[PDB]
Subunit: 251 residues, 4 copies
Amino acid sequence: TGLLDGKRILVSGIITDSSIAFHIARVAQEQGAQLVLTGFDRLRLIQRITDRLPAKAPLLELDVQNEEHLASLAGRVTEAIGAGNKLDGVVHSIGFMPQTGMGINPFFDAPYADVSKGIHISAYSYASMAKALLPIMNPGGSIVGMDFDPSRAMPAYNWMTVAKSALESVNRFVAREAGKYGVRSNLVAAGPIRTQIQLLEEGWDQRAPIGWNMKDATPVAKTVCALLSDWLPATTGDIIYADGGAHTQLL
Amino acid sequence: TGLLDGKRILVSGIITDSSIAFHIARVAQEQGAQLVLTGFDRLRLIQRITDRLPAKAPLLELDVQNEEHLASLAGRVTEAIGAGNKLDGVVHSIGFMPQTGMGINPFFDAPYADVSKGIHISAYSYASMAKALLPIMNPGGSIVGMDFDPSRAMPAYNWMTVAKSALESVNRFVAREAGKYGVRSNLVAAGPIRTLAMSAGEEAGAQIQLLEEGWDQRAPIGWNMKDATPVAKTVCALLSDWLPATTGDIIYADGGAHTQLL
Amino acid sequence: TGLLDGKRILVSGIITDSSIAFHIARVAQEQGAQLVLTGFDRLRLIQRITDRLPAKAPLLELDVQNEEHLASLAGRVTEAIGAGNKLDGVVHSIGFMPQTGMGINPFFDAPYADVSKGIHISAYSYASMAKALLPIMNPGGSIVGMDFDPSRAMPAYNWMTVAKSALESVNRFVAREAGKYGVRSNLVAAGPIRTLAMSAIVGGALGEEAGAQIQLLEEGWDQRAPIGWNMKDATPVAKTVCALLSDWLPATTGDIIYADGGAHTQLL
Amino acid sequence: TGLLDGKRILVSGIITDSSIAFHIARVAQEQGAQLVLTGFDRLRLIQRITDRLPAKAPLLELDVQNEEHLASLAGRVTEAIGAGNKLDGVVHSIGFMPQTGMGINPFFDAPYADVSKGIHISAYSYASMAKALLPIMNPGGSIVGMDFDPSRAMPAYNWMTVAKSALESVNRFVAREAGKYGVRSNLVAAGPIRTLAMSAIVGGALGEEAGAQIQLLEEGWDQRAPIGWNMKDATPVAKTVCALLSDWLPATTGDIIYADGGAHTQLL
Ligand SMILES: NC(=O)c1ccc[n+]([C@@H]2O[C@H](COP(=O)([O-])OP(=O)(O)OC[C@H]3O[C@@H](n4cnc5c(N)ncnc54)[C@H](O)[C@@H]3O)[C@@H](O)[C@H]2O)c1
Ligand SMILES: NC(=O)c1ccc[n+]([C@@H]2O[C@H](COP(=O)([O-])OP(=O)(O)OC[C@H]3O[C@@H](n4cnc5c(N)ncnc54)[C@H](O)[C@@H]3O)[C@@H](O)[C@H]2O)c1
Ligand SMILES: NC(=O)c1ccc[n+]([C@@H]2O[C@H](COP(=O)([O-])OP(=O)(O)OC[C@H]3O[C@@H](n4cnc5c(N)ncnc54)[C@H](O)[C@@H]3O)[C@@H](O)[C@H]2O)c1
Ligand SMILES: NC(=O)c1ccc[n+]([C@@H]2O[C@H](COP(=O)([O-])OP(=O)(O)OC[C@H]3O[C@@H](n4cnc5c(N)ncnc54)[C@H](O)[C@@H]3O)[C@@H](O)[C@H]2O)c1
Ligand SMILES: Cc1csc([C@](C)(O)c2n[nH]/c(=N/C(=O)Cc3c(F)cccc3F)s2)n1
């Protein structure tokens, strides 16, 4: 008798068993949700990985930069869940920024084509996914995406931080559209998960009043399932921080 | 089978059956929680209201301005839940600001005696409750307070808004103390709710009506000010195990109004 | 003697005499700044307009999507201002989102080619300008870009709101780079100003539904603002940008100054 | 010809010549301002200190907790500046939390009697001053208060952080009331400044641990700040206050300007 019993939920973003979306999927199933999964590029590898979930679930291909993939998605989901059935939840757990805009490469050296690809995949796609899927979502449903707090600049993350700032703004507009379908849209801002950079991750655990385990994706997956559930029915266009409370503390 | 099965939860601030705390209590019990209730001043009448709840729960007296009430609280809760047992949740649903600091009385005309009392009860008491009860709380536990978004000023609410701003800062420090016990501390920022207080000058009501109509239109999923259940349910989410990495934070149960400009 | 007496300040984004940049340039000049102006595309149209400023200034061509314009910008500015001289201020007053991303067009119907162009021009370009010009900036210098508060969603602004969220994040990163030169970086978040594009939307050009939305946004701004807001008057915004170009906010960087009548601090 | 030429400005909160208010007063006087000062308790020590300002100014007594001092303030200021004259600027640089609420003491051990005193002095008194002074303020006038960013919890500051949170909210209401007079109300959020009480804690007055926490805070501030942060130097903060009292930020009210080297805009 689980949190998400009899809910139909789409989960994107699994590439490995340490992917945040793997753990979102694992916990959702453990809570009685029936899943449809989406994957990008290495679909052979991803079938392998999704087999490790506790229950079978169909795996659809979705490259968020492919307009055909997006145009046909609602139909393909409906064939996999069965006509007359609709989704109750959608999980966006997709993000990418080329190495020129993330890492040791100076901020000013990122060419715009790279930044733009990163923003397409990491931010614009959240609207793309909601566009495709809202027509096949039931009232009371929920769309959740994955955020990393971009309110302050930080070393290394650079243009990925910019892209997450874009995502948060995207999420607010998607909530206006989702509202029309009685559907909620929110992001979970997670702490750093091991799916300058080490000094940033070590600072997290000390700021977090309850600590932060960067090797454990479960507290993040649980928070996403909270948002997929009926238990936060008045929250939309918002961000829930699953970060051990680190963003609430200066030192 | 319930969201809060076998959890022991203290719930303060029930005065009428339209109190937000009444509805947190009702939903908590529907979800298998075993409750201890606290009440201020009007305890006989408060029993006459809590009788209407789904299950029996002990009612203790607690005036958060009374130092003895606070010093004796851990003990009286421990007598009510049985020695060797500790609370898994605490709900602060306590707020007050005298007429001088809220309504049609000019902002500048509220005396500090009134403002200080308002802040004591509405903000400082969150720290008081956490002090008294953290020693009798289980790891994985959760303290939750009730907030009204004070990020932007608004007509009428005046010094009450100032007090909620204080509360949000208190919440972040209470989170530091609660962390030591593996306990979380969060606030739910509710949209406006028609309790007996809100259902009570002339231009004051008009600005409050404008505030509330504005809330529902801004809220992408709408806002029913007559329905406390969405707020209660959000408080139960936080009392549950499903938000275990969130502390010193604010969850908005406001229909998403605060995320929209128009 | 004036607020910016002796400062050399590059000001971009003049297209008409209702441009926010026109007013920034005017006020800067009234306060003793020596300007270099940059313009996009219609340079002869812009020359006619810049002739209406209190003083003359060199006008250079800068299309922020042109990588060669950017590569040559510092060399060309040095020519204009005299070799051995450097800039003390740079104003980015450049923004653009195609009508597919901003207006009556539904949020979900904006194709990514159009969004990406608008982000290149409205957000990324702030980093581009900083990259090109920081090498010719003096310590205690100031880069100011224009912003429109994207903290909460709103009708019509749509993907321009998203581009301003990006811009806020870019400014925080530009501040880190600018810090190495002793140069500060901030945005001025303005209230709605009746420039060319905003005049068009009100009055029907995109239909009565779009015209009504924006009129409700504007009227709501003035009433929320404790000192009121005059959408017809860019001077208070220009003065704010000049504040930030001066030496009077020397410890503010990576930040946003709101010149919006205080509207964003009030709910109703 | 200076920033505040001929403006009449009340400046509260001078105690020593390292006080933030002392530097605000000095800079305001350097920029041609005509001052009226207010002081608390040790009015003998304060007279001595204010005599070290560049120009003479009337010194009135003001204990913000005294209701008679507030009820008479307007009348006493008027007597000091001349009948038919009004104030253009008011500076609130008054803050206090007893050691039970700030320092090494556990957060939960602050009695409310001490917290309430700190909130009275540090937050409510921003409302009280504006109530007393707005009726003798000119349109285009400015009230400016002092803030320390309370958005995130931090060790030691405890209930003063809470007070600053209440101050920020108070400021947004004061803006509403001041707007009716054509007057702006803003707070300046400063980085840590080595004033009397701070220099003590770093010297070891409060012990090993308080000294080590404040030293960690200051170090981190300077590294987070892209332009750095010199805690010995109050001048950037004083300048920022003067910017706000001037006519150069005329569309900013109910707001917070950060004079913190940009530290609050960077995580690491
Ligand atoms: N790991 C962290 O520290 C952290 C922190 C905060 C937020 N997040 C976010 O969580 C989400 C998931 O990332 P993760 O840490 O689980 O890493 P991950 O590498 O497992 O997942 C990223 C996913 O994005 C997908 N993707 C990339 N390009 C795509 C395209 N063109 N079309 C469709 N999908 C595409 C990949 O297939 C991959 O499954 C991301 O949005 C990430 O930015 C991660
Ligand atoms: N109703 C709304 O619109 C709204 C919106 C957001 C947040 N809130 C907050 O939610 C909480 C609950 O308020 P409500 O709307 O349920 O109104 P309510 O009047 O039903 O409840 C307020 C409670 O505060 C208690 N209280 C007052 N003084 C006390 C003291 N000295 N000691 C202990 N308790 C004391 C009262 O007895 C009462 O039970 C408050 O903090 C309120 O500020 C209310
Ligand atoms: N008008 C408002 O209500 C308002 C409110 C807040 C902020 N802003 C911002 O102020 C800035 C100025 O806008 P405005 O209202 O003065 O309108 P405007 O049209 O006068 O300014 C836009 C300028 O951007 C320039 N531009 C467009 N593409 C360019 C390119 N590829 N390279 C270089 N320049 C290019 C245009 O030529 C024009 O000079 C923008 O950043 C805008 O987003 C405007
Ligand atoms: N690190 C810092 O020093 C720092 C950082 C940010 C903000 N601030 C703020 O700047 C302001 C000035 O503080 P400072 O560092 O110059 O300290 P300071 O001690 O130099 O000045 C504080 C002033 O508060 C006055 N005061 C206390 N109780 C009073 C009362 N009842 N009536 C009138 N005045 C009273 C004192 O007389 C004193 O002049 C305060 O609000 C402070 O919180 C300080
Ligand atoms: C924030 C803001 C408000 S007005 C503004 C700018 C710089 O003037 C604009 N940039 N891009 C703009 N784009 C549009 O208005 C979309 C649009 C057009 F670009 C052209 C015709 C109609 C139309 F609706 S307006 N930026």
